[PDB]
Design an enzyme around this catalytic site. Structure first.
Site, PDB file in Angstrom:
ATOM      1  N   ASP A 121      76.564  69.138  -1.672  1.00  0.00           N
ATOM      2  CA  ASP A 121      77.631  68.208  -2.008  1.00  0.00           C
ATOM      3  C   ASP A 121      77.822  68.171  -3.550  1.00  0.00           C
ATOM      4  OD1 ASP A 121      79.457  66.081  -1.973  1.00  0.00           O
ATOM      5  OD2 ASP A 121      77.990  64.673  -1.216  1.00  0.00           O
ATOM      6  N   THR A 159      84.434  64.492  -0.098  1.00  0.00           N
ATOM      7  CA  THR A 159      83.413  65.089   0.760  1.00  0.00           C
ATOM      8  C   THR A 159      83.859  65.255   2.192  1.00  0.00           C
ATOM      9  OG1 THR A 159      81.694  64.194  -0.603  1.00  0.00           O
ATOM     10  CG2 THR A 159      81.076  64.799   1.646  1.00  0.00           C
ATOM     11  N   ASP A 261      75.884  66.007  -5.975  1.00  0.00           N
ATOM     12  CA  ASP A 261      76.908  64.974  -6.023  1.00  0.00           C
ATOM     13  C   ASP A 261      76.348  63.560  -6.411  1.00  0.00           C
ATOM     14  OD1 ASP A 261      79.797  63.968  -5.003  1.00  0.00           O
ATOM     15  OD2 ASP A 261      78.310  62.668  -4.128  1.00  0.00           O
ATOM     16  N   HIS A 265      77.704  61.645  -9.869  1.00  0.00           N
ATOM     17  CA  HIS A 265      78.440  60.397 -10.035  1.00  0.00           C
ATOM     18  C   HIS A 265      77.831  59.499 -11.125  1.00  0.00           C
ATOM     19  CE1 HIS A 265      81.499  60.615  -6.979  1.00  0.00           C
ATOM     20  NE2 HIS A 265      80.593  61.091  -6.152  1.00  0.00           N
ATOM     21  N   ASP A 308      81.214  71.651  -1.174  1.00  0.00           N
ATOM     22  CA  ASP A 308      82.405  71.007  -0.657  1.00  0.00           C
ATOM     23  C   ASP A 308      83.462  70.782  -1.762  1.00  0.00           C
ATOM     24  OD1 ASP A 308      80.848  69.012  -1.918  1.00  0.00           O
ATOM     25  OD2 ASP A 308      80.911  67.609  -0.268  1.00  0.00           O
ATOM     26  N   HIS A 309      83.024  70.497  -2.999  1.00  0.00           N
ATOM     27  CA  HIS A 309      83.952  70.226  -4.147  1.00  0.00           C
ATOM     28  C   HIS A 309      83.082  70.197  -5.389  1.00  0.00           C
ATOM     29  CE1 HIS A 309      82.141  66.316  -4.136  1.00  0.00           C
ATOM     30  NE2 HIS A 309      82.508  66.191  -2.867  1.00  0.00           N
ATOM     31  N   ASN A 685     110.941  67.599   7.884  1.00  0.00           N
ATOM     32  CA  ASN A 685     109.876  66.819   8.548  1.00  0.00           C
ATOM     33  C   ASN A 685     108.498  67.045   7.889  1.00  0.00           C
ATOM     34  OD1 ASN A 685     109.423  69.372   9.567  1.00  0.00           O
ATOM     35  ND2 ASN A 685     109.574  68.804  11.729  1.00  0.00           N
ATOM     36  N   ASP A 687     106.203  69.250   7.517  1.00  0.00           N
ATOM     37  CA  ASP A 687     105.045  69.736   8.312  1.00  0.00           C
ATOM     38  C   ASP A 687     104.569  71.121   7.835  1.00  0.00           C
ATOM     39  OD1 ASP A 687     107.116  71.382   9.409  1.00  0.00           O
ATOM     40  OD2 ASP A 687     106.649  70.875  11.464  1.00  0.00           O
ATOM     41  N   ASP A 691     111.979  74.567   9.489  1.00  0.00           N
ATOM     42  CA  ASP A 691     112.811  73.731  10.394  1.00  0.00           C
ATOM     43  C   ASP A 691     113.738  74.561  11.271  1.00  0.00           C
ATOM     44  OD1 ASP A 691     111.675  71.580   9.009  1.00  0.00           O
ATOM     45  OD2 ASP A 691     113.578  70.983   8.047  1.00  0.00           O
TER      46      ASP A 691
END
Ligand SMILES: *[C@@H]1O[C@H](CO)[C@@H](O[C@@H]2O[C@H](CO)[C@@H](O[C@@H]3O[C@H](CO[C@H]4O[C@H](CO)[C@@H](O)[C@H](O[C@H]5O[C@H](CO)[C@@H](O)[C@H](O)[C@@H]5O[C@H]5O[C@H](CO)[C@@H](O)[C@H](O)[C@@H]5O)[C@@H]4O)[C@@H](O)[C@H](O[C@H]4O[C@H](CO)[C@@H](O)[C@H](O)[C@@H]4O[C@H]4O[C@H](CO)[C@@H](O)[C@H](O)[C@@H]4O)[C@@H]3O)[C@H](O)[C@H]2NC(C)=O)[C@H](O)[C@H]1NC(C)=O
Ligand SMILES: Cc1nnn(Cc2cc(C(F)(F)F)ccc2/C=C/C(=O)N(C)CCOc2ccccc2)n1
Ligand SMILES: [Ca+2]
Ligand SMILES: [Ca+2]
Ligand SMILES: [Cl-]
Ligand SMILES: [K+]
Ligand code: NA
Ligand SMILES: [Zn+2]
Length: 805
Positions: A121, A159, A261, A265, A308-309, A685, A687, A691
């Site tokens: 993490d 996360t 992680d 922080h 993850d990041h 829309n 997505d 369309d």
């Protein structure tokens, strides 16, 4: 209610988790507060620590011990990971030279190489170089296996969204875990990191790897770990599972570390306190590899080391407060921090207006450190809109900053020096990928790629068919020694018509005018040849795009450009042209300023008309092939054909004209020629998909001319820029954009200045993968190259991020 007076004897870290009120002995029992009374005693043994010492060698087995140094431990699978080193003179895995693993070297009874995902993490990409002196085991994985310089997380770079994207291959908007915190208004329920609601399966969409494996007869270890289970115990648990009989032994496992992680922080990504967590992670990797080596599995297992990041410097003082912009601050709910999501505090508030909230938050302070958006206007590359859990109003927060509702929120909760969550293009949010094992390549570096692609590769590693996902299967084939997935290009669904000259000028009553009654057989056979497609191999360098849906369209050839013209949408789906290094920019001549010419290949009934634009006080028009880049005064007339025209707001035309007049030539000069394919996108829309006509919410006033939501361009050249774009022998280079087609430039705070100070930055913000454009148009590009199809799939997933090194 739990009857916690059942027992964990013989049941520790059970893979089939049992139903309440029967007590639990699984990886997550602690998280549910549901473990049997004797879980700690039986399953979380600690006696004598985690290492064998010289005096423990060949000891009598004592069941109380955390791990074992007795002779039988290997059969049993529960030796301390350093047992052979201390008691049999073996070396640590990290001290052994690396040797190519050409084939899986597995004990009899293994049907496939197991996969172990070692997930960390907040492991920022630059830790691989910056912490290299303190991470010898990880450095050996990296240098001996396959690695990317970094791996791109998804947005938001939190996360839960990212671990679940890893597991599924899906964008958060599709898998449903759109944040660490969420309100679903259909359920009327909230999801949080702490608490019980997150255990409900209705939050978790798609099909994660452990379910994909189980459905297909491949057993999976449990991926999740309760926080209080120590890391050494997670490793020993995986090593015991690997010692199960063939019929019970899982083929896929994950380890999870809350570090670095947790420390990031508190201390920032590069705080001096960060060295120790990196060392501790490396020692854990070391324990795993030593443990595999003892089991003779170290040249049998595929190991993925993945983050993850990343982590950025963020402190309390770098907080923007909505209370500084909004007078109605108590009528809104903000999901705060490194992104913002706003909705109404009460659905009974009829005076809540998102339009006025957005306006009050737009370009109000000179160095404002967040930008408001309606979610449909976010850069398409984020794929962050198509979920009822994502609020209509979004704030994209600058790196290093927080957004909060009121000052009280920040000092009634300085605590932290690091955070993450920002735009997934941000360098500090990048994370890591290393693959090591028989199925991965040896000593190989691969280009950076997105974490959405890994689910397909993990499926390949295990011989599983992946559930439908957002990876492009094959685009990561270059990571793998074997088990590559060999896809076929999708089949074209609609073939084009190639209309010739079929209409007389006077059949068109379009309200259009052009000053073009200008006056030779040398040059008349010449123009006819160009209209028949004589220059098409110069302007369509990689073949025409394939249309992957049912529709009616025409190929139109011209001297300077070729287009696929839609009879349904009354404009090109695509326009293709090549601009050499030497090409000259000209101006639009005075006589041609408002020129629009009928196209005698295309019926008046399938044409736009000038009257609609004249009547529509909001809407103007532009051209897909730029008149400014015509090869000759005579070829210039083709650029004014009604079939090259598209609807454009005056505000957008500033953007488009600067791109076409200035930037295309600049790129051709920098890249040694460019091929450009441009076109409209309709995504009303939001997505991320093309369309159908019945989805279109806006037309040019009084007409059937549909208004695009976005305009794309794909700009291709030779990766070896010493070769011109049109004579390239090898791999290609691409950059692309999907620009929103907006009636104002409110997104760009400096837009009252000259275009040279803001347009290119806007385009950079809206950078895109060719694959994003394919989803949005139903086209398939690069159909005719001499490159391998996997290499083209990698090219189509490339994103030019415009971040420094
Ligand atoms: C990224 O990759 C993913 C995976 O490929 C792509 O997502 C797919 O996109 C498809 C096209 O939008 C979509 O297909 C629809 O499926 C409907 C059946 O859906 C259920 O079954 C699947 C399979 O088990 C399941 O995965 C779905 O899960 C979603 O929904 C649940 C909520 O119950 C969530 O828990 C989960 O997170 C996931 O949510 C996401 O998807 C939905 C859309 O399905 C979004 O609304 C969410 O916000 C979120 O993004 C489902 O449980 C099926 O009913 C649809 O069929 C309608 O539309 C077609 C168009 O062809 C039409 O012909 C049909 O008649 C039908 O129309 C009828 O229903 C309409 C709506 O009610 C109605 O208006 C009409 O009048 C009709 O009566 C459709 O085929 C597929 O489900 C998702 N899959 C996933 C996992 O998301 C995604 O597009 C890729 N992204 C990019 C950018 O490429
Ligand atoms: C989010 C998410 N989505 N999928 N995972 C599992 C996972 C996946 C993957 C991967 F890379 F291979 F995909 C790798 C590791 C994990 C493990 C995560 C994990 O152990 N934790 C986050 C702590 C316990 O967290 C919870 C979460 C929910 C309920 C109860 C406890 N986590
Ligand atoms: Ca994380
Ligand atoms: Ca759409
Ligand atoms: Cl969140
Ligand atoms: K107009
Ligand atoms: Na502006
Ligand atoms: Zn974090």
């Amino acid at each position: 209610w739990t009857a916690t007076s059942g027992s964990c004897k013989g049941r520790c870290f059970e893979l089939q988790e049992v139903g309440p009120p029967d007590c639990r002995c699984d990886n997550l029992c602690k998280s549910y507060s549901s473990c049997c009374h004797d879980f700690d005693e039986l399953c979380l043994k600690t006696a004598r620590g985690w290492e064998c010492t010289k005096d423990r060698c060949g000891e009598v087995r004592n069941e109380e011990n955390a791990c074992h140094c007795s002779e039988d431990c290997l059969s049993r699978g529960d030796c301390c990971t350093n047992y052979q080193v201390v008691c049999k003179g073996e070396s640590h895995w990290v001290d052994d030279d690396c040797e190519e693993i050409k084939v899986p070297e597995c004990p009899a009874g293994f049907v496939r190489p197991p996969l172990i995902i070692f997930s960390v993490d907040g492991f920022r990409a630059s830790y691989m170089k910056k912490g290299s002196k303190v991470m010898p085991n990880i450095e050996k994985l990296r240098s001996c296996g396959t690695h990317a310089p970094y791996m791109r997380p998804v947005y938001p770079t939190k996360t839960f969204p990212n671990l679940y994207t890893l597991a599924t291959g899906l964008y958060p908007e599709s898998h449903g875990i759109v944040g660490n915190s969420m309100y679903d208004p259909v359920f009327d329920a909230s999801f949080h990191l702490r608490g019980r609601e997150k255990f409900n399966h209705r939050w978790w969409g798609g099909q994660p790897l452990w379910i994909t494996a189980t459905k297909q007869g491949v057993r999976a270890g449990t991926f999740f770990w309760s926080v209080s289970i120590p890391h050494e115990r997670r490793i020993l648990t995986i090593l015991q599972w690997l010692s199960l009989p063939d019929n019970e032994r899982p083929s896929v496992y994950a380890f999870y570390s809350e570090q670095p992680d947790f420390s990031g922080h508190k201390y920032g990504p590069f705080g001096p306190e960060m060295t120790n967590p990196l060392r501790e992670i490396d020692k854990t990797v070391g324990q795993l590899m030593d443990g595999l080596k003892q089991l003779r599995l170290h040249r049998c297992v595929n190991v993925i080391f993945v983050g993850d990041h990343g982590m950025e410097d963020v402190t309390c003082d770098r907080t923007e407060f909505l209370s500084n912009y909004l007078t109605n601050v108590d009528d809104i709910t903000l999901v705060p921090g490194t992104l913002g999501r706003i909705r109404a505090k009460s659905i009974n508030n009829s005076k809540y207006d998102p339009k006025t909230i957005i306006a009050a938050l737009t370009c109000k302070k000179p160095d404002q450190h967040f930008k408001p958006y309606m979610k449909q206007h976010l850069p398409k590359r984020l794929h962050y809109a198509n979920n009822r859990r994502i609020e209509d109003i979004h704030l994209l927060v600058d790196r290093r900053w927080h957004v909060a509702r009121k000052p009280l929120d920040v000092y009634k909760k300085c605590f932290f020096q690091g955070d993450h969550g920002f735009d997934n293009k941000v360098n500090s949010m990048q994370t890591v990928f290393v693959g090591y094992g028989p199925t991965f390549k040896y000593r190989t570096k691969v280009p950076p790629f997105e974490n959405i692609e890994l689910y397909n590769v993990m499926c390949d590693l295990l011989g599983l068919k992946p559930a439908p996902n957002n990876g492009t299967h094959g685009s990561l084939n270059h990571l793998l020694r074997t088990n590559t997935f060999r896809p076929t290009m999708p089949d074209e669904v609609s073939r084009p018509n190639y209309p010739g000259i079929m209409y007389l000028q006077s059949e068109f009553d379009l309200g259009c005018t052009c000053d073009d009654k200008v006056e030779n057989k040398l040059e008349e056979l010449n123009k006819r040849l160009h209209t028949k497609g004589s220059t098409k191999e110069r302007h369509l360098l990689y073949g025409r795009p394939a249309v992957l849906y049912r529709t009616s369209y025409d190929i139109l050839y011209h001297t300077d450009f070729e287009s696929g013209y839609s009879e349904i949408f009354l404009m090109p789906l695509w326009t293709s042209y090549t601009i050499s290094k030497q090409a000259e920019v000209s101006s639009i001549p005075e006589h041609l300023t408002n020129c629009v010419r009928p196209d005698v290949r295309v019926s008046p009934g399938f044409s736009q008309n000038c009257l609609a634009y004249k009547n529509d006080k909001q809407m103007s028009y532009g051209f897909l092939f730029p008149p400014y880049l015509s090869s000759s005064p005579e070829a210039k007339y083709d650029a004014f054909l009604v079939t090259n025209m598209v609807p454009m707001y005056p505000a957008f035309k500033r953007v488009w004209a600067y791109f076409q007049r200035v930037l295309v030539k600049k790129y051709a000069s920098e890249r040694n020629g460019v091929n450009v394919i441009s076109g409209p996108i309709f995504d009303y829309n939001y997505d991320g998909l093309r369309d159908t006509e019945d989805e279109i919410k806006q037309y040019v006033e009084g007409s059937s001319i549909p208004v695009p939501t976005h305009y794309y361009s794909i700009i291709t050249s030779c990766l070896d820029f010493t070769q011109p774009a049109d004579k390239c022998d090898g791999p290609l280079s691409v950059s692309s954009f999907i620009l929103p087609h907006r009636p104002d430039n409110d997104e760009s705070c400096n837009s009252s200045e000259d275009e040279s100070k803001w347009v290119e930055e806007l385009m950079k913000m809206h950078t895109a993968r060719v694959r994003d454009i394919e989803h949005l148009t139903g086209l398939d590009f690069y159909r005719k190259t001499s490159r391998s199809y996997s290499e083209i799939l990698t090219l189509k997933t490339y994103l030019h991020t415009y971040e420094s090194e």
